[PDB]
Amino acid sequence: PNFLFIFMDDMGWRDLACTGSTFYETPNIDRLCRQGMVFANSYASCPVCSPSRASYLTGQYPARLGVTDWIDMEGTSHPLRGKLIDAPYIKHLPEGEYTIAQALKDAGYETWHVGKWHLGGREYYPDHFGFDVNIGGCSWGHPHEGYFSPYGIETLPEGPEGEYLTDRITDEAVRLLKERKAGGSRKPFYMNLCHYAVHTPIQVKDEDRERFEKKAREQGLDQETALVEGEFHHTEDKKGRRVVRRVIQSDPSYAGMIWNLDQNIGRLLEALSECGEEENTVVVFTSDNGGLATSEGSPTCNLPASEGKGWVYEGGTRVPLIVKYPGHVAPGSRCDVPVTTPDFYPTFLELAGVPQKSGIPIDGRSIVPLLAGNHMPERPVFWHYPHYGNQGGTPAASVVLGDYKYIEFFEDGRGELYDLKADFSETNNICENMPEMAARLRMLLHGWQREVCARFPEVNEA
Amino acid sequence: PNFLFIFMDDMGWRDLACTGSTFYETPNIDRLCRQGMVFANSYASCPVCSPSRASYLTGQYPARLGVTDWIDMEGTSHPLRGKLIDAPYIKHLPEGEYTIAQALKDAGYETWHVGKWHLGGREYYPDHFGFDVNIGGCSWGHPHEGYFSPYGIETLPEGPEGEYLTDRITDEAVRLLKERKAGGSRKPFYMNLCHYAVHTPIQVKDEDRERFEKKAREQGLDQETALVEGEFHHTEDKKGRRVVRRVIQSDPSYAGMIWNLDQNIGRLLEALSECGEEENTVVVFTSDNGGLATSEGSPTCNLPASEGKGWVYEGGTRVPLIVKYPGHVAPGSRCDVPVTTPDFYPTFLELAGVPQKSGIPIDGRSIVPLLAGNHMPERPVFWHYPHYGNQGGTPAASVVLGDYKYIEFFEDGRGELYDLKADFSETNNICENMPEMAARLRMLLHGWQREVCARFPEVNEAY
Numbered sequence: 074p075n076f077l078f079i080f081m082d083d084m085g086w087r088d089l090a091c092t093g094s095t096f097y098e099t100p101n102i103d104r105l106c107r108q109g110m111v112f113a114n115s116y117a118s119c120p121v122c123s124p125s126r127a128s129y130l131t132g133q134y135p136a137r138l139g140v141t142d143w144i145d146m147e148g149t150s151h152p153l154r155g156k157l158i159d160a161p162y163i164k165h166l167p168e169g170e171y172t173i174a175q176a177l178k179d180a181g182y183e184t185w186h187v188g189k190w191h192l193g194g195r196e197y198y199p200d201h202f203g204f205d206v207n208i209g210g211c212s213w214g215h216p217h218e219g220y221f222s223p224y225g226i227e228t229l230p231e232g233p234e235g236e237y238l239t240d241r242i243t244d245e246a247v248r249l250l251k252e253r254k255a256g257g258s259r260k261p262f263y264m265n266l267c268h269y270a271v272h273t274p275i276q277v278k279d280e281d282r283e284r285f286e287k288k289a290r291e292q293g294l295d296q297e298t299a300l301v302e303g304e305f306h307h308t309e310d311k312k313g314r315r316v317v318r319r320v321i322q323s324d325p326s327y328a329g330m331i332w333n334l335d336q337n338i339g340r341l342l343e344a345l346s347e348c349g350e351e352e353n354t355v356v357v358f359t360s361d362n363g364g365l366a367t368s369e370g371s372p373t374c375n376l377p378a379s380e381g382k383g384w385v386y387e388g389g390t391r392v393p394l395i396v397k398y399p400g401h402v403a404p405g406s407r408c409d410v411p412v413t414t415p416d417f418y419p420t421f422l423e424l425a426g427v428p429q430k431s432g433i434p435i436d437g438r439s440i441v442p443l444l445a446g447n448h449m450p451e452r453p454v455f456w457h458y459p460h461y462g463n464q465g466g467t468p469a470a471s472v473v474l475g476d477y478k479y480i481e482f483f484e485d486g487r488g489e490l491y492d493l494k495a496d497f498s499e500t501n502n503i504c505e506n507m508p509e510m511a512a513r514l515r516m517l518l519h520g521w522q523r524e525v526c527a528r529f530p531e532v533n534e535a
Numbered sequence: 536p537n538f539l540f541i542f543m544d545d546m547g548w549r550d551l552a553c554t555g556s557t558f559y560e561t562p563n564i565d566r567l568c569r570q571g572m573v574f575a576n577s578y579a580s581c582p583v584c585s586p587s588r589a590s591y592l593t594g595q596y597p598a599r600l601g602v603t604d605w606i607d608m609e610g611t612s613h614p615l616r617g618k619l620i621d622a623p624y625i626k627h628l629p630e631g632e633y634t635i636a637q638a639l640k641d642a643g644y645e646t647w648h649v650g651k652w653h654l655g656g657r658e659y660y661p662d663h664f665g666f667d668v669n670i671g672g673c674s675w676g677h678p679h680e681g682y683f684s685p686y687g688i689e690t691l692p693e694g695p696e697g698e699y700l701t702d703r704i705t706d707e708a709v710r711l712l713k714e715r716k717a718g719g720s721r722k723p724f725y726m727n728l729c730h731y732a733v734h735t736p737i738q739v740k741d742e743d744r745e746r747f748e749k750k751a752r753e754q755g756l757d758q759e760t761a762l763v764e765g766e767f768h769h770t771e772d773k774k775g776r777r778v779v780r781r782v783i784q785s786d787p788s789y790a791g792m793i794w795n796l797d798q799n800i801g802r803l804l805e806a807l808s809e810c811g812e813e814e815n816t817v818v819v820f821t822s823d824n825g826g827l828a829t830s831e832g833s834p835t836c837n838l839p840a841s842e843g844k845g846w847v848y849e850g851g852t853r854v855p856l857i858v859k860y861p862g863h864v865a866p867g868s869r870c871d872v873p874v875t876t877p878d879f880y881p882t883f884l885e886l887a888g889v890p891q892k893s894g895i896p897i898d899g900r901s902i903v904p905l906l907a908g909n910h911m912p913e914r915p916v917f918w919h920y921p922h923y924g925n926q927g928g929t930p931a932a933s934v935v936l937g938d939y940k941y942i943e944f945f946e947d948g949r950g951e952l953y954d955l956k957a958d959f960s961e962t963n964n965i966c967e968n969m970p971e972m973a974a975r976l977r978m979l980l981h982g983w984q985r986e987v988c989a990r991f992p993e994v995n996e997a998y
């Protein structure tokens with residue numbers, strides 16, 4: 074069984090037509106959804122980039138790993154400072170880790186990483202962690218020199234001037250498939266396809282931008298207040314600047330990026346079938362964190378889930394998830410059991426038939442039963458973000474268990490309890506109406522924190 | 536507060552952009568949803584028309600009223616017959632029901648019915664049930680003579696040649712709004728606006744249809760297979776015909792009908808604001824049963840909810856629900872607690888400060904705690920549809936409780952159990968895996984059935 078893991082950057086939970094978008098159009102991804110299972114309660118294990126990507130590669134929670142913030146490679150930003158100081162974090166995937174690429178490669182797989190990496194400098198590139206190929210992956214968190222050739226990526230040779238990064242990365246993925254077919258498909262492959270989309274700057278071809286300016290016109294959206302200024306930011310480096318929340322999906326350039334992305338998923342999936350590998354490829358479409366909605370241009374909206382990237386509220390942790398596996402997963406099905414990033418590692422091992430290495434810690438759970446149509450025992454899901462981020466949040470930790478969600482904020486020690494079944498949008502803090510429910514979820518969160526050795530932000534005495 | 540209850544016909548749970556549509560465009564309704572509470576687990580109390588509309592007006596489950604099938608005013612088709620015989624039902628709203636129109640009128644409201652009625656002949660028109668006005672409601676369940684003027688609708692005077700009925704029904708609602716303003720708004724109004732949209736036949740202006748042929752071609756959907764033939768029907772009158780399921784949302788004419796419906800909703804709410812009534816009007820958008828996905832043209836698809844109109848599966852009972860009440864409902868929020876059609880009666884009465892009459896049964900439960908952001912105690916939700924219907928189902932009854940749904944099928948007494956949390960699309964019957972859970976749900980359904988005096992289909996001994 075091949076694994077094709079399509080990992081979007083910063084794609085919010087309502088950023089697909091098939092997961093609830095009111096403006097964006099994603100016909101090729103919609104088809105994939107029709108051919109597989111979609112997950113309504115799909116989470117990333119962190120509200121920003123590198124920790125969720127480290128959690129994916131290791132099947133571990135970010136705090137057990139030590140990578141709990143997005144990696145600022147040249148220390149010009151972290152640690153951020155407010156009333157608290159950002160906690161320190163390991164600025165790369167820790168060296169001793171045994172990744173899913175290593176496990177699968179040890180079990181006979183071809184392992185390819187394509188696209189965004191963001192897990193350290195050259196000593197911690199994909200090749201040191203079980204990957205045979207690295208096309209376009211480096212230490213950058215986004216296209217530092219834009220989406221148009223030249224890109225500046227040391228592991229991606231430049232294309233003709235005017236080449237679009239998202240198109241080229243797809244070509245690179247299509248090239249690996251056809252190459253493998255030419256050599257006889259000796260081994261099952263494992264592709265970690267990490268798009269640079271849809272991270273800022275939102276740079277798109279003009280035909281794709283204009284498409285959705287016309288639609289926003291004929292739809293009336295051009296006349297609707299999309300951005301709304303809110304509170305002041307919380308760190309010294311943004312003193313004076315206010316949080317700008319986007320309250321409606323209407324951004325035409327952002328829609329164009331997603332339209333272009335959808336054509337590329339079309340190209341990619343058509344190559345996979347042209348290689349006679351559709352029947353036996355597990356296809357996963359997901360994202361590393363929630364949509365960007367509260368700063369840096371606010372290209373998208375995640376309402377009725379609150380806020381977005383950088384926040385521990387639902388809008389920042391929720392994420393689309395489609396899984397297709399012909400013959401095994403029922404097409405056009407849906408599952409509502411909470412699923413999180415560290416779950417894929419043991420899922421893939423179970424689908425490959427490969428035992429776990431003794432003694433490595435695994436915080437995730439194989440979702441193979443859900444992919445079959447069966448419930449599983451209730452388990453909590455956790456977050457621990459002891460940083461501010463750039464988007465408006467403040468350091469916090471979180472547990473979801475059943476219908477309830479507990480959040481504690483490190484600035485003032487306060488807790489917030491939500492009944493997400495009755496109150497999906499987190500409008501009604503019921504901490505004090507249910508002290509008992511709060512105390513259980515608070516203690517559960519603290520015990521997990523002790524077990525994974527979480528670090529906490531220290532007060533700022535300046 | 537005023538009540539603008541917008542009651543669509545046969546609109547599936549995924550037929551709006553703001554509730555998961557992949558093709559349809561509903562800007563004016565998306566804005567409504569951005570201004571209120573959307574309900575992710577919204578249910579109609581019956582998979583076909585008349586029982587749910589009777590259940591909405593009286594706050595009782597259809598099996599208690601006796602109206603358990605859509606009303607067939609000629610003896611053309613009911614009772615349908617296969618292995619079993621359709622059960623008898625009352626073909627009108629029963630005489631002594633104290634409906635929410637009466638309850639609010641007696642509390643000083645002005646009451647208006649506009650549009651589809653389908654609750655009996657002349658002696659059971661809205662005026663016999665507490666409404667002061669009835670524009671366009673008769674015994675018809677759909678535009679017998681089409682959506683383009685003339686309509687032959689006994690309570691709607693014909694419009695100029697080519698007038699579109701949904702445009703016209705909206706114009707009548709706007710008129711009532713402006714008349715009340717001219718008169719100085721002496722009383723709060725309760726408006727029961729029942730569109731005939733989106734019932735077959737799917738007739739639309741060509742500019743609307745052509746806009747979504749264009750869209751289907753730019754998205755590639757025009758060259759996909761959208762309709763799939765299936766099992767045979769189950770009744771003598773459709774012997775030889777096969778269920779035809781729609782598997783994608785791609786029908787341009789239906790898309791065009793929802794697009795016109797969206798313009799008119801925009802006109803109506805604009806008029807609501809132009810009369811300065813926006814801030815103190817409870818606005819509800821919902822529908823009477825699930826979308827038509829399996830017969831009679833299969834205009835929409837309800838997937839991942841299986842099947843549609845006329846089945847007790849999720850696609851037949853799930854329905855969109857948005858509630859807007861400025862200053863009271865948080866704008867752009869979302870509740871996942873199951874709500875069902877008979878809840879509106881006690882919700883509206885509580886919102887208006889009116890006590891419910893003594894000694895009248897009410898199976899519904901006010902949802903104002905949910906409109907406030909508060910949870911309520913867990914309750915089961917029930918269905919009793921002892922008829923075949925036209926869309927390919929078989930007589931069945933149903934209870935949803937927490938994460939579990941149990942279905943009993945009258946043809947053979949087989950039971951079906953689904954974990955709707957793990958298995959939303961009802962893929963995996965776990966009745967034999969969790970026997971105690973099944974027996975508990977079965978006995979609760981049977982006890983409810985006893986208490987409401989539900990009737991059961993008879994075996995057709997000639998089969």
Ligand SMILES: [Ca+2]
Nearest residue numbers: 082083122361
């Ligand atoms: Ca990211």
Ligand SMILES: [Ca+2]
Nearest residue numbers: 544545584823
């Ligand atoms: Ca109906």
